[PDB]
Design a protein around this nucleic acid. Structure first.
Length: 353
RNA sequence: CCUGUAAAUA
């Protein structure tokens, strides 16, 4: 169409008043769309009204469109109350469907950010029986997370109530762990208790899972300002990591949990873990065996990071023994003859010097 | 080993 051509072969520019014929067709076009987005951020109310009153009947369709969905979003960002209310009233009865669409879910997500608190819950209530389905969906899990971020959890009882029995499963799912992380962050002390109870028998599996290990890390980085349940669970995580320090350190996923353990654990919790790897004295340190924790760790692709980490978080008396042991390991390999130049040794080398 | 993990748009 001619107007679209007058746009591209010119970018004395056009403005929103120039396209009163062809807004919908401008919105469904990539270039037309970026144009409208740009004008909406700086146009007076009158020009915004004219565009809106023209495309409003096709809001749902635009919400689903690859290029149009941004134009709908800009109306939540730069729109008037009257305009926002109108779009919301077109969403009523359609939450689930929109939330599952690849593009419209982005509009829904933007809307929750901008509409009034009552309209948020009003829309989200439509998902009250589809929560599990929403969390497993590639598009719906983000709407769920957004809902948790924008609405007070007291207004969202149906989220957790739909999850009980499924919490461990979800904590090892790709999307489930994100939601779980949000429920914990934004949940009441009781919600957190309900969640941590379904996990506290499975910390070993969680620590070594490709998704669950993030849930563990999130619990580890909490402070003792939190509830009675966090404190206890944070201890079982430390205790469990203590009992397995070496094997976890050599684990692709669990090695990250050991790092957070020693990074965010209390003075005692930390010493509990380090006392598993520390050479007994200045002598053991100078002459370690190839099967001592330290050495098994220095030589491992994942464990070397946990060693580096220990160097940093180490107190004077333990730090002392750790450094000398590392220095010693470089010597042996250095002298006797193939050449390695491994990055893990290079890293330990310099940071010691 | 120039060393190591997670989600839907132009």
């Amino acid at each position: 169409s001619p107007l679209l051509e007058q746009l591209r072969n010119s970018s004395s520019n056009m403005s929103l008043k120039d396209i009163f014929g062809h807004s919908l067709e401008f919105c469904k076009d990539q270039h037309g769309s970026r144009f409208i987005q740009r004008e909406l951020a700086t146009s007076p109310a009158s020009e915004k009204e004219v565009i809106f009153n023209e495309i409003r009947d096709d809001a749902i369709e635009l919400s689903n469109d690859v290029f149009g969905n941004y134009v709908i979003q800009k109306f939540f960002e730069f729109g008037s109350k009257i305009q926002k209310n109108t779009l919301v009233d077109q969403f009523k009865g359609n939450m689930k469907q929109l939330s599952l669409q690849m593009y419209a879910c982005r509009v829904i997500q933007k809307a929750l950010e901008y509409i009034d608190s009552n309209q948020r819950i009003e829309l989200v209530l439509e998902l009250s029986d589809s929560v599990l389905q929403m969390i497993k969906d590639q598009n719906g899990n983000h709407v769920i997370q957004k809902a948790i971020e924008t609405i007070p959890i007291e207004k969202l009882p149906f989220i957790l109530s739909s999850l009980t029995g499924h919490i461990y499963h979800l904590s090892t799912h790709s999307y489930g762990c994100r939601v779980i992380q949000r429920l914990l962050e934004f949940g009441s002390s009781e919600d957190q208790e309900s969640i941590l109870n379904e996990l506290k028998d499975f910390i070993p599996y969680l620590i070594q899972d490709q998704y669950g290990n993030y849930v563990i890390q999130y619990v580890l980085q909490q402070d003792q300002f939190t509830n009675k349940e966090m404190v206890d669970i944070k201890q079982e995580i430390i205790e469990t990591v203590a009992n397995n320090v070496v094997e976890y350190s050599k684990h692709k996923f669990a090695s990250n949990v050991v790092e957070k353990s020693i990074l965010y654990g209390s003075k005692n919790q930390k010493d509990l873990i380090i006392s598993k790897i520390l050479p007994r004295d200045k002598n053991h340190a100078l002459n370690l065996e190839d099967d001592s924790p330290m050495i098994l760790m220095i030589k491992d692709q994942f464990a070397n990071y946990v060693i580096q980490k220990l160097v940093n978080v180490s107190e004077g008396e333990g730090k002392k023994l750790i450094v000398i042991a590392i220095r010693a390991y470089l010597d042996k390999l250095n002298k006797s003859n193939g050449n390695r130049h491994l990055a893990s040794v290079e890293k330990l080398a310099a940071l010691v010097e």
